[PDB]
Write an enzyme that holds these catalytic residues in place. Structure first.
Site, PDB file in Angstrom:
ATOM      1  N   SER A 145      87.386   1.122  21.421  1.00 57.57           N
ATOM      2  CA  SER A 145      88.004   1.538  20.149  1.00 57.57           C
ATOM      3  C   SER A 145      86.914   1.585  19.079  1.00 57.57           C
ATOM      4  O   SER A 145      85.958   2.356  19.253  1.00 57.57           O
ATOM      5  CB  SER A 145      89.209   0.631  19.879  1.00 57.57           C
ATOM      6  OG  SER A 145      89.827   1.014  18.663  1.00 57.57           O
ATOM      7  N   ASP A 246      95.022   9.786  22.886  1.00 58.10           N
ATOM      8  CA  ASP A 246      94.761   8.422  22.464  1.00 58.10           C
ATOM      9  C   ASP A 246      95.727   7.995  21.360  1.00 58.10           C
ATOM     10  O   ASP A 246      95.962   8.744  20.410  1.00 58.10           O
ATOM     11  CB  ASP A 246      93.316   8.304  21.994  1.00 58.10           C
ATOM     12  CG  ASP A 246      92.971   6.912  21.586  1.00 58.10           C
ATOM     13  OD1 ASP A 246      93.147   6.610  20.392  1.00 58.10           O
ATOM     14  OD2 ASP A 246      92.592   6.115  22.466  1.00 58.10           O
ATOM     15  N   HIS A 295      95.508   3.542  24.855  1.00 63.96           N
ATOM     16  CA  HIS A 295      94.411   3.173  23.957  1.00 63.96           C
ATOM     17  C   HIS A 295      93.638   2.009  24.550  1.00 63.96           C
ATOM     18  O   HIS A 295      94.223   0.941  24.759  1.00 63.96           O
ATOM     19  CB  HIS A 295      94.946   2.805  22.570  1.00 63.96           C
ATOM     20  CG  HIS A 295      93.871   2.534  21.567  1.00 63.96           C
ATOM     21  ND1 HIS A 295      92.830   3.405  21.331  1.00 63.96           N
ATOM     22  CD2 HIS A 295      93.660   1.464  20.765  1.00 63.96           C
ATOM     23  CE1 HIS A 295      92.029   2.889  20.413  1.00 63.96           C
ATOM     24  NE2 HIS A 295      92.511   1.711  20.056  1.00 63.96           N
TER      25      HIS A 295
END
Ligand SMILES: O=C1N2c3ccccc3C[C@H]2CC1(F)F
Ligand SMILES: *[C@@H]1O[C@H](CO)[C@@H](O)[C@H](O)[C@H]1NC(C)=O
Length: 353
Positions: A145, A246, A295
């Site tokens: 991330s 995502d 994610h």
């Protein structure tokens, strides 16, 4: 378990001035080092950083960090969980700078918070050299991330660091998971990524890779936080992992999937988003991009389950390793991008259970 070490250089701090640090599990007789950058959004002005300090304080401070953490996924030392690098030296670097790992600013009488993400990475590397990193053959800088974007911003600086410290034999590589975002138009104060990053860089004294900075030049460095723009400027080998749909991308696009029926406009929007990701990865030789609404991947315990065209991510990473040995490999692919156009058209997508 990985054991906490606070940085001996206490000038290199988390947001609130507490010392930054890293968690380490050594593996003697391994010359592979995995340095993983944690993610967790960012903050970009006084008010939203204050809010983050109230309810996400571990992402701004080491005061309450536990003395150990359990390695999971690619940070696991069990072959059953980590077919790729289970025997490597493992480092987890907590994200406590809220700056997408770009900052180079101290807390001072001008600055309520320190944003030192870029300096934290350099200091971790420096202190690890005395813990065995000086004997390394490969340093894989990985991240999820905001940490995946952090890989893109910092992998070449780690390479330049080691070259200038006199370790040209250590091969630095990057593994950017869920950090490859699009500055696209939203489907429909707290933000369009471009505008938030724009403000953050000023607020953090954020730094970006030199070649990318030279392209976009003063005032436009926010461009270098977007993977498809910064990646072609990088010299270190970088493997890009990105879900085509995502969840963080959809969130900043103001798409909130409700379980309600999806109308034509939103269907076209989501399909076009997947198509645009796929396009940005066409010339990324090492990539893994499944058609899932999810994610992060690489520190999940079940990260081995997802496959693209029948190849798992641990296998793709192993193939990448082979490809960087000193021509494509039979049945051991490194470029794995789904072509099907809707979330979970790939049956191996995470269930969300
Ligand atoms: O890392 C993250 N983001 C980021 C970083 C650079 C450019 C654009 C973005 C979107 C945002 C989502 C996040 F918080 F998950
Ligand atoms: C501590 O880190 C800062 C920031 O990188 C650096 O300027 C300073 O020289 C370091 N101190 C020592 C003793 O290495």
């Amino acid at each position: 378990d990985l054991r906490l070490h606070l940085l001996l250089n206490t000038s290199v701090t988390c947001n609130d001035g507490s010392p930054a640090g890293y968690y380490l599990k050594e593996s003697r007789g391994s010359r592979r080092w995995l340095l993983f950058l944690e993610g967790g959004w960012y903050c970009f002005n006084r008010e939203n950083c204050d809010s983050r300090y109230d309810t996400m304080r571990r992402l701004m401070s080491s005061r309450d960090w536990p003395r150990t953490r359990t390695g999971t996924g690619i940070l696991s030392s069990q072959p059953e969980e980590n077919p790729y690098w289970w025997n490597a030296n493992m480092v987890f670097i907590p994200y406590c700078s809220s700056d997408v790992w770009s900052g180079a600013s101290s807390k001072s009488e001008k600055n309520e918070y320190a944003f030192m993400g870029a300096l934290i990475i350099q200091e971790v590397v420096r202190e690890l050299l005395g813990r065995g990193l000086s004997g390394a053959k490969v340093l894989l800088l990985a991240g999820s991330s905001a940490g995946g974007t952090g890989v893109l911003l910092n992998v070449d600086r780690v390479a330049e660091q080691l070259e200038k410290l006199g370790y040209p034999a250590i091969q630095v590589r990057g593994l950017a998971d869920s950090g490859w975002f699009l500055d696209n138009k939203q489907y429909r104060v707290d933000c369009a990524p471009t505008e938030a990053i724009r403000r953050g860089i000023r607020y953090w004294n954020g730094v970006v890779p030199e070649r990318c900075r030279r392209q976009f030049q003063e005032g436009e460095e926010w461009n270098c936080f977007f993977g498809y723009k910064v990646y072609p400027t990088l010299r270190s080998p970088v493997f890009v992992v990105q879900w085509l749909f995502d969840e963080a991308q959809l969130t900043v696009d103001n798409v909130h999937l409700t379980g309600q029926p999806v109308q034509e406009g939103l269907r076209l929007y989501i399909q076009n988003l997947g198509r645009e990701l796929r396009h940005t990865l066409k010339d990324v030789p090492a990539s893994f991009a499944p058609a899932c609404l999810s994610h992060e991947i690489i520190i999940r315990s079940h990260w081995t389950d997802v496959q693209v065209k029948g190849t798992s991510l641990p296998r793709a990473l192993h193939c990448w390793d082979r490809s960087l040995h000193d021509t494509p490999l039979k049945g051991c692919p490194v470029h794995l991008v789904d072509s099907c156009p809707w979330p979970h058209c790939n049956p191996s997508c995470p269930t969300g259970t």
